[PDB]
Swiss-Prot record, chains A, J:
This is Proteasome subunit beta type-4. GO terms for biological process: proteasomal ubiquitin-independent protein catabolic process; proteasome-mediated ubiquitin-dependent protein catabolic process. One of its GO terms (molecular function) is endopeptidase activator activity. It comes from Saccharomyces cerevisiae (strain ATCC 204508 / S288c). The modification N-acetylmethionine is found at M1. The keyword GTP-binding does not apply. SUPFAM superfamilies: N-terminal nucleophile aminohydrolases (Ntn hydrolases).
From Swiss-Prot, chain B:
Pfam families: Proteasome. Keywords: Cytoplasm, Nucleus, Proteasome. It comes from Saccharomyces cerevisiae (strain ATCC 204508 / S288c). SUPFAM superfamilies: N-terminal nucleophile aminohydrolases (Ntn hydrolases). This is Proteasome subunit beta type-6. One of its GO terms (biological process) is proteasome-mediated ubiquitin-dependent protein catabolic process. The keyword Nucleus applies. Belongs to the peptidase T1B family. It is found in: Cytoplasm; Nucleus. The 26S proteasome consists of a 20S proteasome core and two 19S regulatory subunits. The 20S proteasome core is composed of 28 subunits that are arranged in four stacked rings, resulting in a barrel-shaped structure. The two end rings are each formed by seven alpha subunits, and the two central rings are each formed by seven beta subunits. The catalytic chamber with the active sites is on the inside of the barrel. Non-catalytic component of the proteasome which degrades poly-ubiquitinated proteins in the cytoplasm and in the nucleus. It is essential for the regulated turnover of proteins and for the removal of misfolded proteins. The proteasome is a multicatalytic proteinase complex that is characterized by its ability to cleave peptides with Arg, Phe, Tyr, Leu, and Glu adjacent to the leaving group at neutral or slightly basic pH. It has an ATP-dependent proteolytic activity. It comes from the Eukaryota. Its main location: cytoplasm.
Curated annotation (Swiss-Prot), chains C, I:
InterPro entries: Ntn_hydrolases_N, Pept_T1A_subB, Proteasome_bsu_CS, Proteasome_sua/b, Proteasome_suB-type. It comes from Saccharomyces cerevisiae (strain ATCC 204508 / S288c). This is Proteasome subunit beta type-1. The keyword Nucleotide-binding does not apply. The keyword Cell membrane does not apply. SUPFAM superfamilies: N-terminal nucleophile aminohydrolases (Ntn hydrolases) (SSF56235). Its EC number is 3.4.25.1.
UniProtKB/Swiss-Prot annotation, chain D:
Keywords: Cytoplasm, Hydrolase, Nucleus, Protease, Proteasome, Threonine protease, Zymogen. The gene is PRE2. Present with 8530 molecules/cell in log phase SD medium. The lineage of its organism: Eukaryota, Fungi, Dikarya, Ascomycota, Saccharomycotina. This is Proteasome subunit beta type-5. GO terms for cellular component: cytosol; nucleus; peroxisome; proteasome complex; proteasome core complex, beta-subunit complex. Its main location: cytoplasm. Bortezomib binds at A48. It is found in: Cytoplasm; Nucleus. GO terms for molecular function: endopeptidase activity; threonine-type endopeptidase activity. Its EC number is 3.4.25.1. Disulfide bonds: none annotated. The chain holds residues 77 to 287 of 287 of the full protein. The 26S proteasome consists of a 20S proteasome core and two 19S regulatory subunits. The 20S proteasome core is composed of 28 subunits that are arranged in four stacked rings, resulting in a barrel-shaped structure. The two end rings are each formed by seven alpha subunits, and the two central rings are each formed by seven beta subunits. The catalytic chamber with the active sites is on the inside of the barrel.
Length: 195, 222, 195, 211, 125, 233, 225, 204, 195, 195
């Protein structure tokens, strides 16, 4: 289970993604970044079947970067999420579907609002204040149902996220080797190097 | 390969009043898309002011009822003709069902009568013996059609008092036998329309301190 | 139960009239003797859908043959049946007997079992009910029989096949193919059961 | 969903009330707590019949114990009677999750998790059922040993609510119990249809919902 | 074999004229007169049955044709071209409309489809 | 658990004003082969009951022996064996129904479908069904196998409910049964023309008719049917 | 339950009106009688979407064919086009049809199986109630039936299915196709299954339901000025 | 595994006197896990309303598809599409995917702008039309909805009464289904005004 | 291919001599006509092991019957066969024909197919090859035939069964049961093939 | 995977056993002691299927304690291990076998030697200087192949064991929530409370 979490607060979106890469019986890596920057104010985390995850993320990344150059303009998070959903909805009826679940965290510079989209491999899109894929949600959703507000600061969002990770580290059976946390706001994307 | 189970269809319904209780069931018996009988009784008077129905696979339902009637007979022999209370009957039926936990009686069982304080009682069972006293319960093929209707029209669920707008609930006023039989008849008329295994006839058994009374009503035969 | 028998003046086709779905008789007055050309007919066994589709195609091929090259031989008709049955053997369940009358070749019979092989014979039997009359037909068949003798032979043979096979029944239809023309015959239960 | 945790003022036991048969909600009013004796509680999860039948049977065996030995059974011995029983039926298909919660002088407040797989575990905190994960999330993050009987009762109630909301196969109402030196104490049936909105308003939580 | 005429046979001349379209209009000019009049409660279309021979049965040749139950058509120019257009017009009314929406197309949209077919013969290879 | 080998098809029956009628063809099929053509599938018990059996014939012969043994056993130390303490249809049925449900519960069923037709001591008509699953039901008309699908509809046109029974005479009921048997011969691929019919009347007693045949059949219209669609010749 | 019966000067088809998903009745008044051309009608059983779609497709192509040939469509044309289509899809299009009609050749009655087999007859029945219906047809059919006798026989056969088959129910639809006449479609020819009056009215007091928000929905286009 | 019951959800539609009503729940889940409580299943193209139950990705996909087709219809026809016509467009579109179907249970609702006649319809996942006079149901609690609608419904109800009937049908059916609930929305539709109400229901 | 036929003076049993393992003939001179009592014999079909074990047990039962109660009837012998075949039907594959001669009852024939049912008949046929002669035997059988006529009937019948059935072949063995005694007959290929 | 390790040094045996109990998706407990004292100088750790592990351990414990009382004497580790092996070897051919793997660490007071026995659920016994069950051995065996000596002290054995646990915590995918360590020597059994 490749833990990926997302929380949308007052003025930013925070994505947390596990660092472990386990192939069979061995943890091959403990510092893996399960995310790609699609545009300066849009970040996508991902989790699913080996190989497909990165292949899909980079394919999406390339397409959005192509759009940005062609139009000299950044697509809204909503527009990017719809593009991503259609690709997955197209994929599910293919010969060999992309087995990838994603979270898309973005800051809309037009509306001055943070936005978080949860999309599964079937192409099921939902906009949420907080989201998760896989078994992580079974612990974190109910925890966030209790501790979340729409007017929270970024620092309060990080403390709330630490509470999620602590619970996962206590009750989940796999050692996912901690998480890499990234914040998406009006100034762009940055990584929290100490978590 | 031999399949020891079958599905004879039908639907049953038990409602508990303040000083009475009803146990209703349609009289149709089926296999697949054929009708076996338009009138095959499904609800029985088991003695001691208890009525019973075991809906699903008729062979298992008949066997269970037959065994419980036998249990009542031997309860009298062994305990000086003592009356078997509805709560004691329910517990006895749990043991009959769970005794075949690893080769189940494939039925939904309901019994109705009066508790030891004279109030109406309905007990509902799953196939392997888990039971629970309830005010209202439908069982069988069209149970999914009927129970939501009973939650609404018997326990006044999702119903509030006008003017307050969702703040104050509808008060839980008790229902008379005449009001209950209307809900029963409407329940079965509605179920007959939308479920193919329900129809032909409706037989209701009403239980009071005075004894066990029967009422029969026709249903659509298509 | 179907059969075709050559005799002095030509050939006679014979068949029962039962069509089943499991043990239900979907049609008790079926016509299993079908025409592909003026004096080339076939007996159908197996799938009703497959045999109809095949016979329709063959009739089309022989109609087009006639327009270009004149009247086709019975051997030519059997070859077109074979080509369809052999090349589509994986997707077909059709046991067909082809019978026709030429002036040059007189009465001829070709049987085409499941595989798509062709066998030219003095007489032929096929269908589920044929199994019960292999002994009777072998003992009672003679070459150069009269029309009346041949009708009696088919009538008696199919009578027994119907008696024992549940998948066979109804009336006995027959088609007589000679220089005189095409004669259709029919025999009802009360006639053939008492034989 | 059912939970049981140990703290300063004894034990909290909280359960939901829903029973399902596939996606069909069969009942919203079932009793998943069995009052074995004035100092023993049993929780039920999994097969409804399996849990009911064998936990009422357990109460009969606990009663026979105090008749023969002239003494209340311990939580350890009571839990072990049930675990030894289900172990005999292992492989036959029983499906039970049970927490045997209680108090005795020599043990103090004690909780045992008993499973139809034969597992028997002693512990301070347990959450069992299809909604265990949701309850663990709330309970773990707010648990302290030094809660007040009032704050502890609320946490257990709130943890079930959390699970009733997110888990489709949990819900109905919350039954609360508190176990002390002097036995168990029922703390009411709390319908989720009213409790949810009350908690949302007072606590300011559940912002995922339109209210 | 193969159709090796994959290029346009209708092209712009230096003056900006599309020759083949102009010449097609000249063929229409030579054709027999046909007309249409719209009333408040109906529409009428009419033409002369110019019989090529008195031995010919002019009833068998239909210049006025039903396209849908509520749409009709008449022409002037080359009869054979009209006949195939009617065939295509009838078919396109089903494939591109009736089989989708479960009803016959309105006049303007069927006309639009016929117009499209005629435009393509003006640009295709 | 087994599979049925030599089988018997439909058994049909109905109530009328003074009794019951029951019928069944004389065939023992071996899959698609109509192997035995002289099989009696109606078995009288006393002069007031007839058991009609369909399904596996070997199990039928076993049941036939149980009933024969039942009569023998009832006579033991019973001076009223031919009178007050004679075997009733209700007794015979419940015995069989007990056996059938016991055998299915041991996962070794008697692969049959049984109809017990008879008249009780008080003159009441008895008609009840039981099968390999131990499933039982009663109705004014009862039929097994194909008869359930084709005969019941025809017999229910005569006796659609309980109140129609006193209005139905024996001539009308026998006519309906015989018609139904013809229909089954038209449409059931495992049926025979030859059949047996039994009437149990409260006045005239048990009338057992053997070697009946389906007659007055319609086949002439077959001659006009040519091809499967387009074939004119 | 669908039937087809030939008579003196034409043919009649009939059907019940029940549509089911498993044991549930989806539609109590379904229309199983379809029109291929004005005087060629078909009744369908099996997969509902398949019988409708295959009926509309061949009906569309028959119309275009009739326009091309300047002739009234024939039943054998619809028959041939249907069976070839169904055969191609190897039974995966679950359409079981009774096709009947009148044309310049005369009156015709056929059945079509999903795998592509066709049958000819004077009386036919298809569906889960075909056995109940055929029992009636085999008992009461005769040669040289009148129009009135054939309608009676057909509706009686459907009734057998309605009462005795659980997959069939509600009403009886009929279509009569007589030679030299317009075809008459008799929707709900019989209505023997009307629901009885309910014992109670379940009309609620206004305000009974709890509401959170209200809002007007803008269905109109963007406005001027 | 069964695509039609992974996400869960319900839709119901009713006719009244010169009015129609269509309602849906708001839940979206992954089997037992509830994910979203703002997932509306009713959409509108002009004055024609469409509710879709089943696999959520197909629900979203079909909305986008029918928005696409109705927008082009309007540009070419120079008028908004009517319910009867839209119903045929849905049937057509679904059957073109006969052997690879969208796992959905659509429900059309609306009033003909010309005739003023109320109209509802339902479909199976491959196109079959169920044109009922009284009501249409769809979803994981369709059995429950059939039972409530068949007993509570009566013809010729006024808008404000019809609201109560359909709301109670939905609410009580959803409460007997594990995969339905988590909120609800009801649309009351008249010839030239449409009201949308969010219902207060139990959140479990 | 096995059969038993009653006639005026008694009964005759008949059988082929082929035993197979797939398509290999393990024994071409098998004796399928076996004795359970002086004038009660059986014809065996199906599993060789099952039919031998059964016939051995029956012979034991009738030997013990004879010691206590005197000569058993043919009906009694058929009942013992039935009891074994019926009660052990799940584990047996045995098709047996029982035939015997009494002075009181004369020639009798009982056939016992797979299920364990019993059927008393004028004549009986069984085995895989019997399917091909149902028609021939039904048409050619008469009651009260002479010994010579009955031998010819069996010889012709089994000849055809052998001709068509691959599992049947070799010699034709016959056993005659009359008041005169027990006569064994044999007919070789060169004799019966040319019929 | 329920990590259980064992190392035999100069004068003692050290057993390390994981604390986690994971049932499905949740870690129900993080302080579980997967061991039972069989006798004052014999300790058995265990791992396998839920329920069976404890049931088996306690059953063995009871039997050894019974022996101790009866004879007023402690069985040698070798004797206890042989008894345990026989019970498992008996178990593997039972209706429902014990699905339990064990390590038996003991100090033989007669020979003044520590002894470590590894026994799997089949009843496969081996005496070893160091041992492990399940997937733990895939990492630890090769590590101990490099760092072990027979003359190591108890403190060196614990440092060596810390090296094993660190490797397991780095490369294994499950969070086994650390280990409980117990030492078995001449003075008996004691638990290392800080590890
Ligand atoms: Cl055919
Ligand atoms: Cl041998
Ligand atoms: Mg999702
Ligand atoms: Mg009904
Ligand atoms: Mg036959
Ligand atoms: Mg819930
Ligand atoms: Mg719910
Ligand atoms: Mg053999
Ligand atoms: Mg080992």
């Amino acid at each position: 289970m490749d833990i990926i979490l997302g929380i949308r607060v007052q003025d930013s979106v925070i994505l947390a993604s596990s660092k472990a890469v386990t192939r069979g019986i061995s943890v091959l890596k403990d510092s893996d970044d399960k995310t790609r920057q699609l545009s300066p104010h849009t970040l996508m985390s991902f989790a699913g079947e080996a190989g497909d995850t990165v292949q899909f993320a980079e394919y999406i990344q390339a397409n959005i970067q192509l759009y940005s150059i062609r139009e000299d303009y950044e697509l809204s998070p909503q527009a990017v999420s719809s593009f991503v959903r259609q690709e997955l909805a197209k994929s599910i009826r293919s010969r060999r579907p992309y087995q990838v679940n994603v979270l898309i965290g973005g800051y809309d510079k037009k509306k001055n609002k943070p936005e978080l989209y949860q999309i599964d491999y079937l192409g099921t899109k939902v906009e949420l204040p907080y989201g998760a894929h896989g078994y992580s949600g079974f612990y974190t959703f109910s925890l966030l149902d209790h501790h979340y507000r729409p007017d929270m600061t970024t620092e309060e969002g990080l403390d709330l996220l630490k509470l999620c990770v602590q619970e996962l580290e206590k009750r989940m059976p796999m050692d996912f080797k901690g998480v890499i946390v990234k914040i998406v706001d009006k100034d762009g994307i940055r990584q929290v190097d100490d978590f | 390969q031999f399949n020891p189970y079958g599905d004879n269809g039908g639907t049953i319904l038990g409602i508990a009043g303040e000083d009475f209780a009803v146990l209703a069931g349609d009289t149709r018996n089926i296999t697949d898309y054929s009708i076996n009988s338009r009138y095959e009784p499904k609800v029985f008077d088991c003695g001691d002011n208890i009525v019973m129905s075991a809906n699903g696979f008729a062979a298992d339902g008949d066997a269970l009822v037959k065994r419980f009637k036998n249990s009542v007979k031997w309860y009298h022999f062994d305990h000086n003709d003592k009356k078997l209370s509805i709560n004691s009957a329910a517990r006895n039926i749990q043991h009959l069902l769970y005794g075949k936990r690893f080769f189940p009686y494939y039925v939904h069982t309901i019994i109705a009568g009066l508790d030891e304080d004279g109030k109406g009682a309905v007990y509902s069972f799953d196939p392997v013996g888990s039971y629970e006293r309830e005010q209202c319960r439908a069982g069988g093929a069209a149970a999914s059609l009927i129970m939501p209707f009973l939650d609404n029209q018997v326990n006044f669920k999702n119903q509030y008092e006008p003017g307050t707008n969702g703040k104050v609930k509808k008060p839980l006023k008790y229902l008379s036998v005449e009001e209950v039989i209307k809900l029963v008849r409407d329940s079965f008329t509605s179920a007959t329309e939308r479920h193919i295994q329900v129809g032909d006839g409706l037989e209701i058994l009403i239980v009071t301190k005075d004894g066990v009374r029967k009422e029969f009503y026709e249903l659509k035969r298509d | 139960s179907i059969m075709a028998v050559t005799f002095k003046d030509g050939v006679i086709l014979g068949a029962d009239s039962r069509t089943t779905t499991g043990a239900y008789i979907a049609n008790r007055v079926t016509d299993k003797l079908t025409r592909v050309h003026d004096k080339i007919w076939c007996c159908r066994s197996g799938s009703a859908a497959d045999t109809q589709a095949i016979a329709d195609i063959v009739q089309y091929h022989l109609e087009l043959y006639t327009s270009q090259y004149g009247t086709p031989s019975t051997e030519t008709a059997a070859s077109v049946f074979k080509e369809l049955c052999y090349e589509n053997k994986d997707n077909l369940t059709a046991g067909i007997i082809v019978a026709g009358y030429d002036d040059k070749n007189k009465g001829e019979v070709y049987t085409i079992p499941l595989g798509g092989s062709v066998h030219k014979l003095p007489y032929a039997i096929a269908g589920s009910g044929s199994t019960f009359i292999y002994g009777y037909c072998d003992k009672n068949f003679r070459e150069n029989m009269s029309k009346e003798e041949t009708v009696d032979f088919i009538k008696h043979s199919l009578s027994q096949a119907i008696k024992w096979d549940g998948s066979s029944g109804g009336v006995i239809r027959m088609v007589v193919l000679t220089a005189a023309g095409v004669e259709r015959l029919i025999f009802y239960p009360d006639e053939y059961e008492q034989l | 969903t059912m939970l049981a945790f140990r703290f300063q003022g004894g034990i909290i036991v909280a359960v939901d009330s829903r029973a399902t048969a596939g996606n069909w909600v069969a009942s919203q009013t079932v009793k998943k707590v069995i009052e074995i004796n004035p100092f023993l509680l049993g929780t039920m999860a999994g097969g409804a019949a399996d849990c009911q039948f064998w936990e009422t049977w357990l109460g009969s065996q606990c009663r026979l114990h105090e008749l023969r030995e002239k003494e209340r059974i311990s939580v350890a011995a009571a839990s072990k009677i049930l675990s030894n029983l289900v172990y005999q039926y292992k492989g036959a298909g029983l499906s039970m999750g049970t927490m045997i919660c209680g108090y005795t002088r020599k043990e103090g407040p004690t909780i045992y998790y008993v499973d139809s797989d034969g597992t028997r575990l002693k512990g301070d905190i347990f959450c069992v059922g299809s909604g265990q994960t949701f309850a663990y999330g709330v309970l773990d993050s707010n648990y302290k040993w030094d809660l007040s009987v009032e704050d502890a009762l609320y946490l257990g109630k709130r943890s079930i609510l959390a699970a009733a909301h997110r888990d489709a196969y949990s819900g109905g109402s919350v039954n609360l119990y508190h176990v002390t030196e002097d036995g168990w104490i029922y703390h009411g049936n709390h319908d989720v249809g009213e409790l949810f909105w009350k908690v949302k308003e007072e606590e300011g939580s559940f912002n995922n919902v339109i209210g | 074999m193969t159709d090796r005429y994959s290029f346009s046979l209708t092209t712009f001349s230096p003056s900006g004229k599309l020759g083949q379209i102009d010449y097609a209009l000249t063929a229409v000019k030579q054709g027999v007169t046909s007309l249409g009049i719209k009333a408040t409660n109906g529409v009428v279309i009419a033409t002369e049955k110019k019989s090529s021979s008195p031995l010919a049965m002019s009833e068998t040749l239909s210049k006025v044709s039903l396209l849908t139950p509520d749409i009709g058509a008449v022409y002037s120019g080359m009869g054979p071209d009209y006949r195939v257009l009617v065939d295509k017009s009838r078919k396109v009314a089903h494939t591109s409309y009736k089989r989708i929406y479960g009803e016959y197309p309105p006049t303007k949209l069927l006309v639009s489809e016929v117009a499209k077919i005629m435009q393509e013969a003006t640009q295709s290879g | 658990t087994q599979q049925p080998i030599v089988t018997g098809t439909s058994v049909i029956s109905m109530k009328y004003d003074n009794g019951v009628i029951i019928a069944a063809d004389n065939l023992g099929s071996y899959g698609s082969l109509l192997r035995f053509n002289g099989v009696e599938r109606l078995i009288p018990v006393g002069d007031n009951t007839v058991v009609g059996i369909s399904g596996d014939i070997s199990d039928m012969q076993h049941i036939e022996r149980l009933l024969k043994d039942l009569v023998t056993e009832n006579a033991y130390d019973n001076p009223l064996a031919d009178a007050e303490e004679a075997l009733e249809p209700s007794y015979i049925f419940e015995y069989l129904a007990t056996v059938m449900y016991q055998r299915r519960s041991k996962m070794n069923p008697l692969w049959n479908a049984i109809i017990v037709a008879g008249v009780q001591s008080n003159g009441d008509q008895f008609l009840r069904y039981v099968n390999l699953l131990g499933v039982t039901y009663s109705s004014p008309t009862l039929a097994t196998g194909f008869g359930a699908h084709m005969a019941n509809p025809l017999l229910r046109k005569v006796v659609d409910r309980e109140s129609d029974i006193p209005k139905t005479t024996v001539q009308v009921a026998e006519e309906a049964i015989v018609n139904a048997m013809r229909v089954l011969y038209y449409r059931d691929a495992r049926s025979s023309r030859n059949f047996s019919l039994a009437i149990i009347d409260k006045n005239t007693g048990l009338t057992f008719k053997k070697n009946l045949q389906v007659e007055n059949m319609k086949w002439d219209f077959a001659k006009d049917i040519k091809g499967y669609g387009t074939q004119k010749i | 339950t669908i039937v087809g019966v030939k008579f003196n000067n034409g043919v009649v088809i009939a059907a019940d009106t029940r549509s089911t998903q498993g044991p549930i009745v989806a539609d109590k008044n379904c229309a199983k009688l379809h029109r291929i051309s004005p005087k060629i009608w078909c009744a369908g059983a099996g997969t509902a979407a398949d019988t409708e779609a295959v009926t509309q497709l061949i009906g569309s192509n028959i119309e275009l064919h009739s326009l091309y040939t300047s002739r009234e469509p024939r039943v054998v044309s619809a028959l041939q086009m249907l069976k070839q289509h169904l055969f191609k899809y190897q039974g995966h299009i679950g359409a079981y049809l009774i096709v009947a009609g009148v044309d310049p050749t005369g009156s015709h009655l056929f059945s079509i199986h999903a795998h592509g087999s066709t049958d000819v007859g004077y009386y036919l029945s298809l569906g889960s109630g075909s056995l109940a219906a055929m029992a009636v047809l085999e008992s009461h059919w005769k040669q040289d039936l009148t129009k009135e006798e054939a309608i009676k026989l057909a509706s009686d056969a459907i009734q057998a299915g309605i009462w005795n088959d659980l997959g069939s129910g509600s009403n009886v639809d009929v279509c009569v196709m007589e030679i030299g006449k317009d075809a008459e479609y008799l929707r709900n020819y019989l209505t023997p299954n009307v629901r009885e009056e309910k014992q109670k009215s379940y009309k609620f007091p206004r305000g009974t339901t709890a509401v959170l928000k209200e809002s007007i929905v803008n269905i109109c286009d963007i406005q001027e000025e | 595994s069964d695509p039609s019951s992974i996400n869960g959800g319900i839709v119901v539609a009713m006719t009244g006197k010169d009015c129609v009503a269509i309602a849906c729940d708001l839940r979206l889940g992954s089997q037992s896990l509830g994910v979203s409580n703002k997932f509306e299943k009713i959409f509108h193209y002009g004055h024609v309303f469409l509710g879709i139950t089943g696999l959520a990705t197909d629900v979203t996909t079909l909305n986008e598809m029918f928005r696409y087709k109705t927008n082009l219809y309007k540009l070419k026809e120079e008028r908004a599409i009517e319910p009867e016509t839209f119903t045929q467009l849905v049937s057509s579109s679904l059957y073109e995917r006969r052997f690879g179907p969208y796992f959905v249970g659509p429900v059309v609702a609306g009033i003909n702008s010309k005739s003023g006649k109320p109209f509802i319809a339902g479909f199976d996942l491959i196109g079959c039309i169920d044109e009922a006079k009284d009501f249409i149901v769809s979803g994981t609690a369709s059995d429950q909805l059939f039972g409530m609608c068949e007993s509570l419904y009566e013809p010729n109800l006024e808008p404000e009464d019809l609201f109560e009937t359909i709301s109670q049908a939905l609410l009580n059916a959803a409460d007997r289904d594990a995969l339905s609930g988590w909120g609800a929305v009801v649309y009351i539709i008249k010839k030239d005004e449409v009201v949308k109400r969010y219902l207060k229901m139990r959140q479990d």
